[PDB]
Amino acid sequence: MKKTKIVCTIGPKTESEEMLAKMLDAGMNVMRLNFSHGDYAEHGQRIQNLRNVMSKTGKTAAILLDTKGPEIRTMKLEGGNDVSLKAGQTFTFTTDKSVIGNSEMVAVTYEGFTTDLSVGNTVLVDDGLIGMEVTAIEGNKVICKVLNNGDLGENKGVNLPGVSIALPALAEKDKQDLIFGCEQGVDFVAASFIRKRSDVIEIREHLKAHGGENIHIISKIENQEGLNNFDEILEASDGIMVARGDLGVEIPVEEVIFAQKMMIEKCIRARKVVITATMRPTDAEAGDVANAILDGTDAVMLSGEPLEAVSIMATICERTDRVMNSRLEITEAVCRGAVETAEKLDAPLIVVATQGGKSARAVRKYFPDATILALTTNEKTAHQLVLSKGVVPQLVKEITSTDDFYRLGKELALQSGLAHKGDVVVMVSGALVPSGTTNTASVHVL
Amino acid sequence: MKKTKIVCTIGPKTESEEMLAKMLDAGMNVMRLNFSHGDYAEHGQRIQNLRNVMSKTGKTAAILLDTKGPEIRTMKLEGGNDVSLKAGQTFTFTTDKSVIGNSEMVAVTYEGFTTDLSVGNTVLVDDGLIGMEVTAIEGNKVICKVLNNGDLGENKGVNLPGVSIALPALAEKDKQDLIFGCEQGVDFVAASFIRKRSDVIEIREHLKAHGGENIHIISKIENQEGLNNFDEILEASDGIMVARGDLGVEIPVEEVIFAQKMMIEKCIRARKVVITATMRPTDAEAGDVANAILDGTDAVMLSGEPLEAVSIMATICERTDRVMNSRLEITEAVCRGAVETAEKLDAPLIVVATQGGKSARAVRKYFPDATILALTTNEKTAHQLVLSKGVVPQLVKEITSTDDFYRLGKELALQSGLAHKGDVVVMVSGALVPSGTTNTASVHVL
Amino acid sequence: MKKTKIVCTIGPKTESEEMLAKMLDAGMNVMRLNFSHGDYAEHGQRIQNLRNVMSKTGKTAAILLDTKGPEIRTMKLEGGNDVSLKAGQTFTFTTDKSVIGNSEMVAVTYEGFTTDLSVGNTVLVDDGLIGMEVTAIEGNKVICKVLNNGDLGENKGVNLPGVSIALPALAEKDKQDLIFGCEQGVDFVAASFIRKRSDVIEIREHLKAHGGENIHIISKIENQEGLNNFDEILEASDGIMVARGDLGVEIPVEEVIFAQKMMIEKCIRARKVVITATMRPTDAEAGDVANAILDGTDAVMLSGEPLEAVSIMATICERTDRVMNSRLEITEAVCRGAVETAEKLDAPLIVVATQGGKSARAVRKYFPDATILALTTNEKTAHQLVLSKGVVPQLVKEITSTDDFYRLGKELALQSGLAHKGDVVVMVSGALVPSGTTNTASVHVL
Amino acid sequence: MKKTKIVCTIGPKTESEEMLAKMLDAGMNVMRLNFSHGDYAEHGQRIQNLRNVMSKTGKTAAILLDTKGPEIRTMKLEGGNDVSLKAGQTFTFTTDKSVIGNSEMVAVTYEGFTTDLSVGNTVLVDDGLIGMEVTAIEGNKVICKVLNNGDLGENKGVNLPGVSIALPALAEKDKQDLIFGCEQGVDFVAASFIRKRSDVIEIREHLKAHGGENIHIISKIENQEGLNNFDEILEASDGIMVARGDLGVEIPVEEVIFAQKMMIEKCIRARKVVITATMRPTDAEAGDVANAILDGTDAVMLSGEPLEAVSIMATICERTDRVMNSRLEITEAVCRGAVETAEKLDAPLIVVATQGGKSARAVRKYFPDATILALTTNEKTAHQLVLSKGVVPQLVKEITSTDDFYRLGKELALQSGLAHKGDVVVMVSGALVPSGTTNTASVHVL
């Protein structure tokens, strides 16, 4: 079986339960829900359908609701026709939504545009297709020198590298989508356009205000600022999502692959999950994936793409997984040890008891060869760990004591078909210490 | 300065001595001549302008002559019109070149088609565009079930994956371009579609028969059969060219990045050069490269693409090189040592004497942080060294003995601007041993 | 505190409970009863006075009954006067007990003297004071040339180096002292002159007929035959005792220090005990001790030597102990694990539960810096662990489970004064597995 | 052959040319001349017969002058009679030489006896045979309590543990002996009772005023103050000597084996020689030596002991060296490399060119398995190296260049019988660098 997890974004062509069940077989592990479109009626059904499939089949799966996030946008162009901007010429951005663009100027969805900006700064239109330096700003007008030739189409995204934009972590709508997440009880929330440590707090603050406390926050890094603040942001988050394309528009090309690498390394050390979103696939892509997985990503995600797409990502996840190796060089010490020994003894698995899922995470850090079977009485947690690499969670009634665990665990591991009589198996867990503390390890033959 | 070498394909837009002198400043290291087009006069001019540039500036550069190689193709279609192939329908291939194609059948340029093929096999037309399984074969006819919908144009490329194709090794025109090589005295010849050790032999054999004894043969791996005989192919070749696309059409997507990976590894171990040929650039590509560099390729190529392309590829070469590490875990011992010590002492350079260039290869296999400065009396060897990672060759008049070598080397090293007063410097070379044997290292302060 | 355990041979001048108490203060851990002298009343008393100081102060210590064993001896001399033997002269030994020696001949206590011997063999008189080569053998006489000048006193000890002597495993008296040992419940019996595996089985077999089943048998290695079968002897014993002087008589001087070194390593890896008997002490001696510790002996030994001797031995034991280091390169896994982590985390101690003493041992093998505190409900086992390096037993009423164990252990760890609040502490023990299997480790802060 | 060097102190019973050469055949490697006795005529003869033997057999051997050194001593007793001292009694020392002692008092040779001492101090008489506590000092007398019962004979040597005795570095006849050693050209002078760096300097100045510049100074560490300044004394000397017995009298017992262990370690690392002087032999001793070897001493010394002594000494050296192993974890890199490389390739020997003997030294530090063959034109140097571990020196005419060296060393190696056709051999040397610098290495097949 593969170990890497796959995240698909679901939609119309794929929301039926019959579709979802097949997608589960193809390899999907989490259902993404993009708040950039659709509605509460649809999404809620989408979600319902997944859960019915789960009940009907014993299959497990997480649900992640993806935030739209703040966004600046260029408006309307005369007769809806693309205009061509010439280098060195003048070009003007406006705050007035009424205004119909053309080759002389254009309106932006962002009222705060005039403010945050400054002459000297760089503006970047439509996925950085066109750069410009702000020469002037007066009233609702942003006046600039185009730095290079290009076609300005309508509704193009704007980027201001380096500038801190005063929009909120939370769009107005962004707040409503969250509540829906909590009411629905989504497992994760991938927050968009996160630039500094505060952005994570505000969503945590927000989710807490609506019963969302046990929801993991996956911060989406998408720019020079979030990149600079990554440590802080990673600190505050429950996970991370490397938005390659998005980030690619805001910084040097030779940096992207690296950023993705530093982010993943940092997440791994940190015990936090990381989703990598890159661009049959073109080979550039099939190796871009494999590389993300070699870099050690927990999960790869699939976007607007579908049953064949799944299976290919799924035969790629397996092929790259089957050749990776552990990375051995208190919870740490126990966990590393578990793994190592796991490996020395040739244990096919490593059962683990986790309430909040931390120990499965801590174990999964060393890239074990064995599958982690994680035990839990907590349902959100059982759902969440579906995101994490090599983990295979199992909700359980209870675990009375360390010895009960070992006993139970052995019954379970044997039921999983993941192990057999004579198999040695390593058990990791807590013993006389609060949650959030892994500290006991134990070998056992099935 | 980078250390990964760049290989650019030159053309009309890039042939003047003024452009070529620019491209060298941009990072180019080896001119590729693609025998796929052009003519002897142009190419020869192209080569002359490079050499002029060389004399003029003292800049060095090598010269690869890349081969067109053999192929299986589809012929003529009625009216010269594209036919529409429907899935599951029958479609027959014919050995008889006189036959004019249509929706029901088409003739291939390959007489052995019937022979090498066999029921069950997959036939792939126009770059993988359309696939077909072989149902029957009889007379000059290959009967097939068409696997998927597509349009058949004329002169389309055929590929029969897995199959051992009985075509010859060199094209007839191939034979002619090689001689021109041997007359113009190019540094390397990259053979095309190399499937088994003998194909390598045939080129060597041809090259010797016309003054080409010292030309290195870099072999292009483009399919399953070459892939499977890699060891022997590598053995007999002087180096290798990872042809990603071509490979991408012949075997599973999830394999390609792994084929490249195993190629580079085995090359480096083998002391031979490997050039990476992958698909401002889409991020996928900008990483694809870096990854190739990280996996350890000596050089990366640039095709039909131009002065900015080179520069970028440079910045990508310098940026990925600046963070790799040596890889330390008789010629070998000496060489390895030379490197670790080079490193212990903080040596900015490792002067090396080479006739055939093997010693410099030997040093480089360890991925030195230091630049390898190479001394040679042999010009072909000096040019070819350009294709090597981190190596900086220098033609020198002579070296009378181990001690002359040390003294000269010191002089040279200081002249290079590469090292200075107080810099330690390691110096490998042969001593009382035939060429092909390295065995002496000596540390020195400038 | 030192971790190496010191063994004391008790006698008249040191048997008072008063004396013993002071001896235990100075460092003594074991009471050695040399069966080569004294009588069942005196030993018994010696035993009881110890057991008394034990009850009276909670101290712990064990008692080893050292066997006299079989031996060959010269007998009576005319007028009981010492005869001077001249080099090269003739001298003969006889089997006939009635015969009274003189300068030409002497009888031996050993009837198999003629039979096991052989012309050319070396015969060693009185702690090798005089050597002699066997020149002839006829009837009950063994005719020999004298190799060196010396006086033969009566009742002299005989050594046939290299010879395989057929004496039995146990003297008739030996079987008698063994029973008393059983009656008295000593901890260990150090068997004398062990030659081959059968010797050990006889001893073991005899103790079981005596209720001595849980008595550890320690093999005394005194000659080449014993040294040859070491591995098989060690396998059947519970531990070994390196009898230096005795070995010195029986084999090449250059071999003894290395035979010692070999026996200790093998015994370590075997998880079995080894007591070191070497020859204020002479620096030679002082060093000789230090080195047995460096070689890693669990325990050293003091003979006919008394309070100052125990103390010094001890200041040397601590001196050497304080600079040793662990030795890290199922039970093994866990135990190796446990110590390493113990060391990583600064654990000043390693609690361990043991019935049989096995895991305390297992842990021990790694030469931990932390003290091993061993909890056991078995007192025999608690006594025997006194013999083990760095281990410190504690008898406990019971442990109901792994968790009961942990809670209990931390109470006891803190009470020991051996550890404090904030201190980290490793705990090993079995979980769901029979005795003889260690398999679980857990870290805990006091 | 053994690699460890042996030092034999020579005497009447061993000064004959017939006796010496037998000794060299027994294993002797340096002749120790003890200036504690004898005269200029005898010792010189003693060196004569040695040099002669060398001439007549081509055997090499070095010669060490050993210093008597300054001292404090007790004097004359009434009637030249021994007095018995009873414990707790009073006893007094006096700085007055006229006074003839008795059971109440005895004068000392050392005028600073009062000044350097202090109440509470321990005074050891006649090789520590009798301890005494200083209770008072007034005028020229040192009042003390006898610590134990014993007989005081005349002219007994005194030791003041821990005290810093202000005697000079050189006893007045010590300078004379030094001039004899210069005139006689000895290889090494072993200085006595070295306490601090300045003592080592004084002697270096004394040999220099007499053409002694090439004689290596081996400082003998006898007590606590010198053990303290060892780092600085090691620095200023050419090697050291661990005078166990004298150390054994001056500091705690558990401390000596460690002091010897620290000295040897710091010696090895410093590329300096160390002679270990420990107490058929008693096991203790035969193991004591082996341990010095295992600790890594260059050489072991023989004292007032003779042909069988050397033999056994040697057979132990072989039995020990045959089981030691290299110790691999500028000159340093090159030499470590050389060794390591030497070992990887299986070289039986490592030729080294040396003037000053240094590189023979740097190479040996690593504990090579291969014999070092050192080539030199300096005969002092060649004699000196005999003292060095595993080195085999050779005087040679000249070496014109690095290449000649290689050519020469290759003939020599094969001639030595130490290697053969097909054997690889690693050669080190200097190259374009003043003496004191090693920096070249080169592998060769014989």
Report the CATH number at residue C390. Answer: 3.40.1380.20
Same domain for B155 and B21, yes or no, is no
- Residue C73 buriedness (CB in 10 A; 0-12 / 13-18 / 19+): middle
Both tokens of B423, joined, read 């810099």
Which member of A253, A278, A320 has the closest CB to residue B281? A253
Please indicate, yes or no, whether residues A206 and A313 belong to a single structural domain of this protein: yes
Domain match, A89 and A99 both: yes
Report the DSSP beta bridge partners of residue D62. D30
How far does D248 lie from chain C, in Å, by closest CA? 6
**H or E element that contains A380:** helix A379-384
Question: Which residue among B254, B257, B290 sits closest to A315, beta carbon to beta carbon?
Answer: B254
Which residues from chain C sit within 8 angstroms of residue D285, using beta carbons? Answer: 284
String of DSSP letters for B23-91: HHHHTEEEEEEETTSS-HHHHHHHHHHHHHHHHHHT---EEEEE-----EEB--BGGGPPEEEPTT-EE
Contact residues, chain D, for C283 at CB < 8 Å: 244-245, 247-248, 253, 256-257, 279
**Cα–Cα dist D308/D28, whole Å:** 12
Identify the chains in contact with A, defined as 3+ C-beta pairs within 8 A: B, C
What does the buried/exposed string (b/e) look like for A307-333 if buried means 16 or more CB atoms within 10 Å of the residue's CB? Answer: eebbbbbbbbbbbbbeeeebeeebbeb
Are D315 and D248 contained in the same domain? yes
Bridge partners of A394, per DSSP, are: A375
Q: What is the enclosing helix (H) or strand (E) of C146?
A: strand C141-146
Tell me how close the Cα of D433 comes to any Cα of chain B, in angstroms.
Answer: 9
The candidate with the shortest Cα–Cα distance to A274, out of A211, A364, A334, A175, is A364
The domain total for chain D is 3
Give the residue among A436, A440, A326, A310 at the shortest CA–CA distance from A381: A436
Contact: chain C with chain B (3+ CB pairs below 8 Å): no
Of the candidates C432, C419, C423, C431, the one whose C-alpha atom is nearest the C-alpha of residue C392 is C419
**To which residue do tokens 């370590």 refer?**
C268
Length of chain D as a residue count: 446
Residues in chain D closer than 8 A to C257 (CB atoms): 283, 286-287, 290-291
End residue of a domain, out of B289, B320, B351: B320
Query: Are B297 and B331 within one domain?
Result: no
Distances (CA, A) of B274 to A89, B243, B388: 47, 11, 8
CB-closest option in D247, D255, D288 to C288: D288
- Method of determination is X-ray
Nearest CA in chain B to A260: B287
Tell me if A360 sits within 8 A of A352, measured CB to CB. yes
Take residue D306 and report the two structure tokens written for it.
């003779």
Type of residue at D97: K
Same domain, D137 and D199: no
- Crossing angle between the packed helical segments A307-321 and A17-26, to the nearest 10 degrees: 20
Q: Given C280, C299, C320, which residue is the final one in a domain?
A: C320
Give me the torsion for CA of B90, B95, B100, B105, rounded to 10°: 0
Q: Beta-strand (E) ranges in B77-184?
A: 83-85, 90-94, 105-107, 122-125, 130-138, 141-146, 150-152, 157-159
Active-site entry in C46, C220, C358, C364: C220
Judged by CB atoms closer than 8 Å, whether chains meet at D431 and B344 is answered as no
A284 to chain B: closest CA residue: B284
Amino acid type, B34? N
Minimal CA separation from B440 to chain D, in Å: 4
With H, G, I as helix, E, B as strand and everything else as coil, classify residue A83.
Answer: strand
How far D407 CA sits from the closest chain B CA (Å)?
8
Asked whether residue B45 falls in the same domain as residue B174, the answer is: yes
Is-contact C114 C48, C-beta < 8 A? no
3-class SS at B269? helix
Give the nearest partner residue to D286 out of C257, C282, C319, using CB atoms: C257
Q: For this experimental structure, what is the resolution in angstroms? A: 1.8
Domain CATH code at residue A62: 3.20.20.60
Contact (Cβ atoms closer than 8 angstroms) between residue B107 and residue B101: yes
Fill in the amino acid letter for A155: N
Q: What is the CA radius of gyration of chain D?
A: 24
The secondary structure of residue D420, as a DSSP letter, is: -
Instruction: Tell me how far apart the alpha carbons of residues C7 and A374 are, in angstroms, rounded to a whole number.
Output: 51
- Please tell me the number of Cα atoms within 13 Å of D322 on its side-chain side: 11
Active site residue D364: no
- β-strands B372-376, B391-395: how paired? parallel
Show the domain range for C22.
Answer: 2-69+169-320
Q: Is D32 a catalytic residue?
A: yes
| A435 lies in the same domain as A313 | no
Question: Is there a catalytic annotation at residue C195?
Answer: no
Separation between Cα atoms, residue D70 and residue A277, nearest integer Å: 83
**H-state helical runs in B322-439:** 331-344, 358-364, 379-384, 402-415
Q: Residue D114 belongs to a domain with what CATH number?
A: 2.40.33.10
Closest CA to B95 of B107, B77, B103: B107
Tell me which residues of B are annotated as active site: 32, 73, 220, 278
Residues B264, B183, single domain; the answer is yes
Domain shared by D13 and D76, yes or no: no
Tokens of A353: 């008891």
Closest among B9, B158, B6 to B71, alpha carbons compared: B158
Report how far Cα D380 is from the mean position of its chain's Cα atoms. Answer: 17
Q: Residue type at B18?
A: E
Best residue in B130, B247, B254 to probe A by mutation, most A CBs within 10 Å? B254
Instruction: For residues D109 and D214, state if they share a domain.
Output: no
Is D325 buried (19+), middle (13-18) or exposed (0-12) by CB count in 10 A?
A: exposed
Q: Which of D250, D6, D32 is nearest to D128 (CA)?
A: D250
Which of D22, D59, D68, D73 is labelled catalytic?
D73
Which residues face D84 on adjacent strands?
Answer: D151
Domain boundary among A268, A292, A320: A320
Q: Which positions in chain A touch C401 (Cβ < 8 Å)?
A: 401-403
Instruction: Give the type of residue at C214.
Output: N
Chain D residues whose C-beta is within 8 A of a chain C C-beta are 244-245, 247-248, 252-258, 260, 278-288, 290-291, 312, 315-316, 318-320, 323
Tell me which amino acid residue C180 is: F
- Choose the mutation target among A335, A403, A426, A446 for the interface with C, i.e. most C CBs under 10 Å: A403
Find, among A188, A259, A273, A192, the residue nearest to A230 by Cα. Answer: A259
What lies within 8 Å, CB to CB, of C176 at 6+ separation is none
Q: Whole-angstrom distance between the N-terminal and C-terminal Cα of chain B?
A: 21
Q: Quick one: B313 and B251 in the same domain?
A: yes
- Cβ atoms within 10 Å, residue D90: 13
